[PDB]
Design a protein around this ligand. Structure first.
Ligand SMILES: [Ca+2]
Ligand SMILES: [Ca+2]
Ligand SMILES: [Cl-]
Length: 123
């Protein structure tokens, strides 16, 4: 769920408010996404977007009355390291991994303010 994703990003980037810094950025960071990613951070979001898409394809996820944005899963942040729980069932575990990968990706690429609140005509 979005709440967990937010926590994961703060886990890797303690100085950030993910729902603000990583929302409405580039062509993919935020609800939806299309076009060519504008930078590596945007590409991180595209990958996470595609990961969610693959999740929806899983039989495990079709049974859930929740979407990746509201589907709660379990994880822990310790010493700024993210760990997905073995108590997560198939769908939740897949989503947890999608988010963990993105949070780590976000923390390893440049953040370009010029791409924040990007004019969708660039997508
Ligand atoms: Ca997106
Ligand atoms: Ca386009
Ligand atoms: Cl980690």
């Amino acid at each position: 769920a979005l709440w967990q994703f937010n926590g994961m990003i703060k886990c890797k980037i303690p100085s950030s408010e993910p729902l603000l810094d990583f929302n409405n950025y580039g062509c993919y960071c935020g609800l939806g996404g299309s076009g060519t990613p504008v930078d590596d951070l945007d590409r991180c979001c595209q990958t996470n977007d595609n990961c969610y898409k693959q999740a929806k394809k899983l039989d495990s996820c079709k049974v859930l009355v929740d979407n990746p944005y509201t589907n709660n899963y379990s994880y822990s942040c310790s010493n700024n390291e993210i760990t997905c729980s073995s108590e997560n069932n198939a769908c939740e575990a897949f989503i947890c991994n999608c988010d963990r990968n993105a949070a780590i990706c976000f923390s390893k690429v440049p953040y370009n303010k010029e791409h924040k609140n990007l004019d969708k005509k660039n997508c």
